[PDB]
Amino acid sequence: TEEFDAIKIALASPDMIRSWSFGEVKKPETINYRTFKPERDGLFCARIFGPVKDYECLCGKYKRLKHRGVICEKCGVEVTQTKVRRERMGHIELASPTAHIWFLKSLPSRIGLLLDMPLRDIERVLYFESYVVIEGGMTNLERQQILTEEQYLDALEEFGDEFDAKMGAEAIQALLKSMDLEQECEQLREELNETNSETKRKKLTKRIKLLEAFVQSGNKPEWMILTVLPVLPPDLRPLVPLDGGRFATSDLNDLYRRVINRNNRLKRLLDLAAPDIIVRNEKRMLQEAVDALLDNGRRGRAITGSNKRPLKSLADMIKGKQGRFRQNLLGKRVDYSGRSVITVGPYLRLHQCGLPKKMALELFKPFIYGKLELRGLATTIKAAKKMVEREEAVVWDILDEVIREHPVLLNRAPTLHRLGIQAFEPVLIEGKAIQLHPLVCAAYNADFDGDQMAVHVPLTLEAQLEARALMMSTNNILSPANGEPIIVPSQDVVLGLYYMTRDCVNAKGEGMVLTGPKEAERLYRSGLASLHARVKVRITEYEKDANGELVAKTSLKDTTVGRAILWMIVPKGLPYSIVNQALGKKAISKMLNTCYRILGLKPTVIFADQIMYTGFAYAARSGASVGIDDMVIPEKKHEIISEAEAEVAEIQEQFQSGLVTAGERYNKVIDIWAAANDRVSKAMMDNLQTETVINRDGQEEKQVSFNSIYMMADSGARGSAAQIRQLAGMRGLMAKPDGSIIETPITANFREGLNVLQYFISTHGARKGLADTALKTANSGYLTRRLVDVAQDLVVTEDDCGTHEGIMMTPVIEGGDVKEPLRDRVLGRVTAEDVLKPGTADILVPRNTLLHEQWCDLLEENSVDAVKVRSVVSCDTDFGVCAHCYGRDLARGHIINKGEAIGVIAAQSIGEPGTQLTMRTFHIGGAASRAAAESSIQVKNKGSIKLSNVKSVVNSSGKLVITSRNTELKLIDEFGRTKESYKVPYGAVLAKGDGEQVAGGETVANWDPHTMPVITEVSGFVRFTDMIDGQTITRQSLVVLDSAERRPALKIVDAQGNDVAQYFLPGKAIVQLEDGVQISSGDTLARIPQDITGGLPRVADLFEARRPKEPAILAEISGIVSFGKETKGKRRLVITPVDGSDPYEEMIPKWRQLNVFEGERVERGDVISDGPEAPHDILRLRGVHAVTRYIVNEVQDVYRLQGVKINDKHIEVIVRQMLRKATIVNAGSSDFLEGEQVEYSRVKIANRELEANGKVGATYSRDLLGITKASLATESFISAASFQETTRVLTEAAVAGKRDELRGLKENVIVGRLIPAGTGYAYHQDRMRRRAAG
Amino acid sequence: MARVTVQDAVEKIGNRFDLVLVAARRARQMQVGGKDPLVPEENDKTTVIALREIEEGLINNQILDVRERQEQQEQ
Amino acid sequence: RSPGVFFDSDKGKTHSSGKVLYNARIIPYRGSWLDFEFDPKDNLFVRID
Amino acid sequence: MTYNNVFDHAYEMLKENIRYDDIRDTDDLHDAIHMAADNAVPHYYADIFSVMASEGIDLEFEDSGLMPDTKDVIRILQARIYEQLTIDLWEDAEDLLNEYLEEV
Amino acid sequence: MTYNNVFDHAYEMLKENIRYDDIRDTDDLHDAIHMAADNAVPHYYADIFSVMASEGIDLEFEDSGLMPDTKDVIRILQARIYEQLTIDLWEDAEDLLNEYLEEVEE
């Protein structure tokens, strides 16, 4: 059959239903309960929907069904279209066509109702007491008015003959036929052009767009009123929610026979010519039966369901019973995939794992049946079923032929990212448990304690190709979210290579003049240990001095035995400086990283496998044990503890003095015991030296020890200092959720004997740390749920992006030292046509290139400041993305290909951090204060500095302070790269004069949060004001006045004998001087002091795009802006004078801060810094650039607090998905001041400027509403609102006449098709090419 | 010969996504019948044979189109 | 919870400023429970069931 | 009982307040409209939650300063209902001042 | 009106989870309830303000530990439906365990 690509839901024509099914139906004797035989014609029985049993008919004659297109006696002869069950439905004939209730009540009166008439009167005239007169004229009333019985009696008395008014929907049909749609649309466009009411605007735009949906839908709205209705199949019904019955005794049959019974009674009473009240009662009960059959007919809260009303609504069985979430949500028959306990397998190279015997004998049972049929060993199927039960040797031979080169999927139940399911190759393992590759544990995020993993068998050949082509563990070496390699050795291979490449002093064997090098043979025979001293062996090495070739060299180097054996592992000549050190997690991870960067993908997998093999084989020969001699006790420890408690006794004397309060004593106890913990940590680190030594004495270090705990602490794989200090020395403080701690912590360790109170208090740390695991799991799942629900309609569809404009890449960090360099951000993304040296007329790339490590080395050896990067949003692509800007796709090495699913990797990259942030970085104490001495703003790196947004304030001293709000510092490192983002406070006291530059030392700022830059530039005494009471009640030499409760700005005094600048209002102002005091310039006049990033709800606040607590009002193009600028009587800060008119005057409710003092002309895009910034105003005025930088840098400032690293490509993809709903200003062809799709707007602009028009429709503004309507902005009904009511969406997409047009990924999950991503997009393009080719 | 990574087959035709459908439509004729493999089997399944036939650079879209027109003309 | 006289400070929950609210909820063995309430304007109220 | 019923109820109460108080000034509409915001909201929580299930009201906020500081749920959604009703009743009160000056 | 459909769907999914995971105790049988609390709850604010408007669920809480502490109302209204569903499905789970031992003739 054909496929489903883009089909509208238009109204079913009566002619299409009469051509769908043809025949006559009378006397509904449908199902006889005592016969169970094929009866006559009826409605919804065995006579309709063809036969009830597969290939036969019981009609009396012609059971072969030669002809087609007749209903002879009791069976359906005509099929003519499809198979037996998927054929036509049937029809019912109504004497009075009733309207559909979903247009009459669209929750509430949304679509299918508006005709310049209220909902309540239309609901009243469809009842029995009122009606609407049609085809009137020559009177005072109109056709839109409502009438009662006496009013219609007076109307027929006055109007006389030719009066027409029907109780049913036929008068609505005649009124809808009489009203012209085009003339009504013209009148509503004229009313939109003439009227000015704001509530009228949205109503008229909804009316115009609905009538345009009716016009360009090409269909009659009178098809909304149901005249002939098809029925549904009886086996389409599921079972009842109560106990198990039959299909004929279901809940729908009573409502169906009620509707058919009222229809036949209407036919009989119209053939009998009943009076008016009887036929109106018949039409009323028929309309009530139709309205009860379609929906439940609820009006309000619906306080109680009427004793489980049987099938009240059709929408309830479409949405709830059958399930809108039908595919891939309940789980749906996993079908030869099962669970077992995961064990480790120390063999079977990376693209291989283990599988149990009695499980793999069962997993390939149809494959065993098929191969026994193919080889001719089993004649029948029962013979094969017996040969499986006998379990003889040839069955195991066939099973070995099955498992030999066949893939499989291993799939844990928490898959927070894509590497939770990985494809491998099964090998038979004796037992019932699964052996896994040892190094896949960080990608699985679980340890070997009995965790389970489903074993999905690829059943089709294409699934085998999907497993061996995309989902293997050898295909994915890097992580798909960071770029860090995911395969990392964990404490086995790490300890083996740490013991392998460990040096010693004066061991056996010295001066090894060797060739080959072959240092393992004398280790194996006699006289040589693997930890020997520096011997000179000959080590050959390959290099890449020739492009595409290998340059071999030969040199003798001083090394150890284990490094010489480790060089035999290394293929094709890696650089020697990475294996000439001690190997921990960092060193082995950097070795694997450089091996992946240099050798590619094929040597690094066998390199990692052979590193794992030699690490296992030499950690087995190591034999590290943890004994009582390994744990060491510091010899001064008790003394330190004594000193500690002595200091506590001194504080206790202060506790008897009366000079130290409770919190100060608590902080002193925390500081003293933390200093004692630091002293015992340094004493333990000194005592780890010289424990297990070789026979050598008199040296300085004296043979650094080989106990296991110092090897694990120095290796840094799992042994960290925070647990070695808890093993030996002092444990210190604990963690309590109440926020307090004891005043005499644990003095002993786990080497010595603890007290009962010490263990009783140390239990609280486990009580605090245990509750973190179960919490915030469902919230982290729901965040990823919404991020997929907002970003499922993006796939790669083209090849070239075709732009010159992109997001400018600037190196920015947090406060303090450097956090992320520029080279991590330049690597990846494809740059634009122009990158610049500081020398003129010098370029690097002609147009573009694939940025790998050689271009990073070229940019590292040269000087670069800013990199122009081709990127998102800008150069939008119709029906998807070209994604040429998406360069260097992670976990693979190649150029980007078409059909890659983008967006579902984004939510897995955002959702990959854990359940709760850990930013305490210490114990429960620490004495975290606001500021110890000062804020300490200075420069660290060399280079000249540049100050941004500063002034020239006249001062008496040599330094020049500033009074600005925003101040930035630019630093010269290579060619203008700053690499130092120091948060300068608003109006910081600068110790350096403005206009001078210096590099190295000379700290330019010294700010204290107690002052305020409100000074005088001209020397002179204070301006005399009036001192009145009432303004001295302000909060955080006396204060005189206050501008908040009413310091206002006055004229500055310019003379020492005469009583004669601009003073802004920060919100709090306290006068620190007296009127009439001789003061000089640059002195204290009046000083008093007065965004939020980080958190797991902060991520939700970022990706929901909610409005902050304090919104910001930006500045447009140039106009005269100054304090007051003709403010009104109330609601201050209204800017009326603007040069260049621009009639845009905003009204501020006086809550906001004073905006500007300097900058009498401004530009579109100036910052105002009114607390948090409003992203929608920056999107409307500045553009996509600052909003993208704002969201991406706030996401990175959230991520850097914990150390997790996620590339900005996924976040910018989510930002691209959140930039729909483009609202226009200039009216276009088919739109007027509304919001539509961005791609449709680009298509309309291209069709305007292409052939005929000059410019019709332009200057559109984007929206950043966030998560609510952007997830509902999918313009296909199959994933418009899947959670919400189904028929509510279906009615809107039926009247609107919208097309699906195949963009989306969850769309073909809800419907069920080949998804247009990966290899499915290849099948889509092959079908679209074979359709055009023939 | 156990194939580790199909990337050397991607060097011939680089999409990573056409390779699955091309190998599938090549291997259906060898799985059903009426065709002979150009590469002898190394005691494996037809999947590894399809990966190695794409890796050697013998079968692409043009050869499949020519052989499809030849089988339609011969039938 | 054994029958007797209980006390709680409520940590400024229903007002959210940081002022404490002391209560004396009497507990019977069976029947209705009686609790006392402090107001932000420094008054008393009674909660029953 | 949907959002349109509460909308028509607030419209009728605002018409009654303009007819009673006889206000022809735009700044003097502060005492009426908030009372029109006060008497149009329901007290039963199910009657509150039934309005939110219909179209005409949204969850987004125009101003965050109107939201109080509480730990519950019904107070925030109730203040959202007050905010949406006042945003409707400003543009309704303009047209009702026009109809009151053009009616009598 | 709509809470009954969510209750019946949760009962059906929890019956299928205990039928599939075939465990036969009352101490370890909670992960099937975690399947019912994470799947049967509605996603967005439309059904959440629609189900709670119907009868069967109240605002008050049975256990103090399951109440979330956040300023977003939608998380608290989802955890409300989850906690009420677990409390209303514990006894129904034990009833279908009592019916479960002799249900299918095997």
Side-chain angles (χ1 to χ4, degrees), chain A residues 156 265 407 412 521 535 589 621 648 659 915 933 1009 1082 1097 1184 1300 1311:
Chain A
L156 64 90
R265 289 180 187 271
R412 291 182 66 249
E521 60 182 0
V535 296
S589 179
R621 293 177 65 88
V648 173
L659 295 174
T915 179
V1184 185
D1300 293 332
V1311 174

Side-chain angles (χ1 to χ4, degrees), chain A residues 107-109 197-199 300-301 1106-1109 1268 1288, chain D residues 1-2 4 46 50 53-55 59-61 64 91-92 95:
Chain A
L107 187 43
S109 69
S197 176
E198 293 292 327
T199 59
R301 188 264 184 95
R1106 292 182 183 271
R1107 282 89 171 94
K1109 184 176 174 66
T1268 299
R1288 183 178 177 179
Chain D
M1 186 180 288
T2 59
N4 289 319
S50 179
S54 66
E55 59 92 20
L59 193 274
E60 291 86 3
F61 291 160
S64 296
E91 295 176 354
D92 288 331
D95 291 331

Side-chain angles (χ1 to χ4, degrees), chain A residues 809-864 866-874 876-881 883-918 920-921 924-929 931-933 935-939 941 943-974 976 978 980-981 984-985 987-1034 1036-1045:
Chain A
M809 186 64 72
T810 61
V812 292
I813 59 169
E814 292 180 353
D817 55 354
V818 64
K819 298 296 289 183
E820 293 180 354
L822 183 60
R823 282 89 172 94
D824 291 331
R825 295 177 66 88
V826 174
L827 180 61
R829 296 178 184 271
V830 177
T831 62
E833 67 181 2
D834 290 331
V835 291
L836 279 75
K837 295 186 180 69
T840 61
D842 290 329
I843 61 170
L844 290 172
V845 294
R847 180 66 179 87
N848 52 2
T849 188
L850 186 65
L851 278 77
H852 58 89
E853 294 292 327
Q854 184 62 255
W855 293 99
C856 294
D857 291 331
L858 290 173
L859 292 173
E860 184 178 1
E861 68 182 3
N862 290 318
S863 65
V864 66
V867 177
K868 185 68 180 294
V869 174
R870 292 174 65 188
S871 63
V872 295
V873 194
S874 296
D876 53 353
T877 303
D878 291 331
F879 293 161
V881 69
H884 183 74
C885 301
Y886 184 73
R888 296 293 296 163
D889 195 2
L890 294 174
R892 289 178 180 91
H894 57 86
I895 61 171
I896 189 63
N897 292 318
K898 64 180 74 174
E900 182 68 28
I902 303 298
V904 294
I905 57 173
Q908 294 176 356
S909 66
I910 295 167
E912 68 182 2
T915 179
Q916 187 177 2
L917 59 93
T918 304
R920 63 182 181 179
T921 196
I924 198 66
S929 296
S935 181
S936 179
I937 296 99
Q938 73 270 15
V939 296
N941 290 318
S944 66
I945 60 170
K946 296 186 291 294
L947 279 75
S948 179
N949 297 115
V950 297
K951 294 187 289 183
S952 296
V953 176
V954 176
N955 291 319
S956 66
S957 296
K959 66 181 178 67
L960 297 177
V961 299
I962 59 171
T963 61
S964 66
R965 299 293 296 164
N966 296 115
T967 301
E968 293 179 353
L969 294 174
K970 301 292 183 182
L971 185 63
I972 301 297
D973 290 332
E974 293 88 5
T978 63
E980 184 177 2
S981 296
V984 177
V989 176
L990 294 174
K992 184 68 180 294
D994 292 331
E996 293 179 353
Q997 295 178 356
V998 70
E1002 192 177 1
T1003 64
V1004 299
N1006 192 0
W1007 181 253
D1008 194 2
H1010 188 75
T1011 64
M1012 188 68 203
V1014 179
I1015 60 170
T1016 61
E1017 293 179 354
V1018 180
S1019 296
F1021 62 95
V1022 182
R1023 179 69 176 173
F1024 182 75
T1025 61
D1026 291 331
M1027 294 182 286
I1028 195 66
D1029 291 331
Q1031 291 85 17
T1032 61
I1033 60 170
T1034 187
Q1036 302 181 189
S1037 66
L1038 294 174
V1039 64
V1040 176
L1041 294 174
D1042 194 1
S1043 179
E1045 294 292 327

